[PDB]
């Protein structure tokens, strides 16, 4: 009933755009977790589009070092399509990664019904290498570079990706929780002025300030539809250790929550990617339920959940 | 001499608020760590009045899904007859627990001597179902419902109860550490305008502005007597392990530092509670020590331990 | 090349200044963790001045209460001459202890050829007992009171001292991080009104106008050279577990390089200790590693590694 507790769930059960097997059950293990039970316990109308079927493509060889591109490239076409099918629907897409590769079809798909979005990018990482300043040839490392307009000429013809049309422009992006820039990418930041509170501006300002900044930034000017892009990796390990990049000093559980409580009551949540999580990662079994709680509680707090607590409109001393 | 160090200790060996054994234990265990020693080592004039004799009743069923009524409030009884003692007797109230729902008794206690006085509640939870609100029927989460004057004709004849005169206004009382709140709970302190910082308004504001907000509000007007009831679940269970419900993503240590020597600068705390210590609940021994010693601490910082240092009046140069 | 990455390396193998072996090697285990290697990754000019050889003091009875104080004051008599021979060819002194006993020496060495210097002190202790409001006995904890002009005439004529000429005034030094301070210790400070963040400023203000006020404080009459004296015991035993005197309740990982990152951007870091390690100290091999990695972490932050990025002066996107 209400719109910002209208929601389309898909899963991206994806891993090809990093070399870790693993990431593929997030959507599994984040279900069996009870997600969708414990949306619907909090006033959400939620549909299950079920986990999108990605078709093996064995001809894959590299494009220059950068790896799976025809793979990476059509799980993001496939992906941008759902989304935008359950955006036209009237639904809050809820992504279930899957390697933040599909950042490509999430944002772009969003984007076909929504093009005035901005975006937040909770991360460890820029993700926006190019396929030229890539050392690592690993997508889910290059995916904001595809999105980019002002990246358009930079970007070669990568086979898979024929069909992405940039759709973002250096303003339409914050970054919180920056940790591990490579040099290319930090060149790329300073380069087009994207706004961005790495760990140190957390430190500096508080997440209450980096929230307040984060979001007159997005909606000062007008209102306008949110794109969350959330690595669990941007949280400390200690949170989310089940991950494929984790870099030490993150995000706390509680600043993990505090960003999402915010957003929710924008009210302009309309997009949402729930990224890398990696059961087979987990030291122990203790980590694994560790990251997928967290994991979980984020996507809550998205939709709703307040740490004060929630009442349905009645009278409880009646 | 000092009167924010001028200490009478009552131990309170009694678990029925609540379903687990153990928290019985809290004062032995405290004790056995030295904190009547320690609290000596730093010029307090310590009385120890003893462990209460709390008599079984063995005869106790349920007021409708409201568990050991009878026991529960006897042994509150008992204790607010014992706080009004030390209170009379010029000391600061030291309450070991044992379970929150002993908060009626000693609250109500410490008010019999001091009616004026101002509460903190430091806790993961609100504790202020109603026999009529609660879900659980465990009274250590509806102590605050019983001493409150607006809720005075919601709570039913409990049988054990009969004694309790409602001795706080909505006003009186300010929260720290909300993070599992029910929803007849947030009806409750949203319809009374209760004062709260949920962990969601720590994350916002730091525990600086937090406790200048919490004193500012409770002693602005005038100056009047504190009660802190601590609940050890309103530190992260990384801190307070050994307690019968613990919840992630809670204030620190040093946040639990913070708040206690906040208070003991004011110069006004007069009651102060030392709740939910569960040893039996500790997974190693360690999580019971680490627990037992993180209680220590706030306790000391409460009576005037402060991480800056603590000198007597003397020329150490001499 | 650039004056803030021009580096000057000594290794002071030494323990006297407390009880326990093992901190000898603190050298040895940062040189294995790649710190130089790392150090000329991030464009600094990096020499090995190698690791001083202190000779043994066979006879070193105790002065009064304090401890092999022929062999401390003798230590740090060497390495004052070492660090202002690498002052004296331009770099800035990097010292690996080693015990903090080794700062009167570091620190002297500094004021040498740059008698202006401010101090920062990042630790739980004040470091600042002299050798008679001292009941360890143990001289890491007494540099401090060597070097300070106000406490000239109450340092008494300690074996291996009479080469010591005290170089900074009470204004000269900003501590961070103060947890555990001894009565005298505290009574000096606050004698002196020597300025200081404990750990309760910390939480009061947040780890970025603790930078602030730090930086404004020793910079704002005019420019000068930073020492920086590190005991990694400043930070949170969780980060740094093997050391000799942990406290919990410490500086985070993220504050740690807050700290570092804020002083290397003012371009005027001179001098820098990285003090307290000791391996042997470690509960297990993973609380050796976690210890050195968040050591080098810090070092490496003091010469320019930013959390947000780095980049040479050229166009990545050609
Ligand atoms: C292994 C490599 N040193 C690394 O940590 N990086 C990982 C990072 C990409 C991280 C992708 B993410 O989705 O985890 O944010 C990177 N920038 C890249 O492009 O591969 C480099
Ligand atoms: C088990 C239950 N889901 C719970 O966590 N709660 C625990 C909480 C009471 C906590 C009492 B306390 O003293 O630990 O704060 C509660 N509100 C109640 O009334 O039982 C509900
Ligand atoms: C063992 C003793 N209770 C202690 O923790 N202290 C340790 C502290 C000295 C710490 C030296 B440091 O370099 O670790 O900062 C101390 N002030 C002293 O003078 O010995 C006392
Ligand atoms: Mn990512
Ligand atoms: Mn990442
Ligand atoms: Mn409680
Ligand atoms: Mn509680
Ligand atoms: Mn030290
Ligand atoms: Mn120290
Ligand atoms: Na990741
Ligand atoms: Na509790
Ligand atoms: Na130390």
């Known amino acids: 009933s209400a719109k910002s507790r209208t929601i389309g769930i898909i899963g991206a059960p ?3 755009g ?8 997030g959507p599994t293990v984040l279900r069996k977790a009870g997600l969708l039970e414990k949306l619907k316990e909090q006033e959400c109308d939620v549909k299950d ?17 950068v790896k799976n591109p025809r793979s990476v490239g059509k799980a993001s076409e496939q992906l941008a399509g759902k989304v935008a099918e359950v955006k036209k629907n009237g639904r809050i897409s809820l992504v279930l990664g899957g390697d933040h590769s599909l950042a490509i079809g999430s944002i772009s798909g969003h984007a076909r019904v929504h093009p005035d979005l901005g975006v937040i990018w909770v991360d460890a990482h820029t993700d926006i290498n190019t396929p030229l300043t ?3 040839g690993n997508l889910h490392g290059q995916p904001v570079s595809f999105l980019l307009k002002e990246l358009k000429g930079k970007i070669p013809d990568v086979p898979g990706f024929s069909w992405v049309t940039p759709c973002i422009s250096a303003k339409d992006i914050v970054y919180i929780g920056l940790r591990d820039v490579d040099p290319g990418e930090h060149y790329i930041l300073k380069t087009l002025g994207i706004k961005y509170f790495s760990m140190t501006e957390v430190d500096r300002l508080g997440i209450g300030k980096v929230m307040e900044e ?10 306008r539809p949110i794109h969350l892009s959330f690595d669990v990796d ?3 390990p200690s949170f989310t250790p089940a991950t494929g990049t984790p870099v030490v000093g993150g995000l706390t559980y509680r600043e993990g929550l505090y960003i999402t409580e915010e957003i929710y009551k924008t009210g302009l949540l309309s997009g949402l990617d ?11 079994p203790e980590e694994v339920t560790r990251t997928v709680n967290t994991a979980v509680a984020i996507t809550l707090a998205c939709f709703g959940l307040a740490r004060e607590g929630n009442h349905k409109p009645i009278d409880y001393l009646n």
């Open 14 to 16: 994806f891993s090809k």
């Open 18 to 25: 990093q070399p870790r097997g693993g990431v593929e059950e």
């Open 49 to 65: 589009y079920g986990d999108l079927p990605f078709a093996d493509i064995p001809n894959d060889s590299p494009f220059q070092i």
């Open 134 to 136: 890539t050392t690592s």
């Open 214 to 223: 984060t979001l007159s930034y997005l909606l000062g000017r007008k209102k």
């Open 234 to 236: 941007g949280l400390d």
């Open 274 to 284: 729930i990224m890398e999580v990696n059961p087979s990662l987990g030291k122990t």
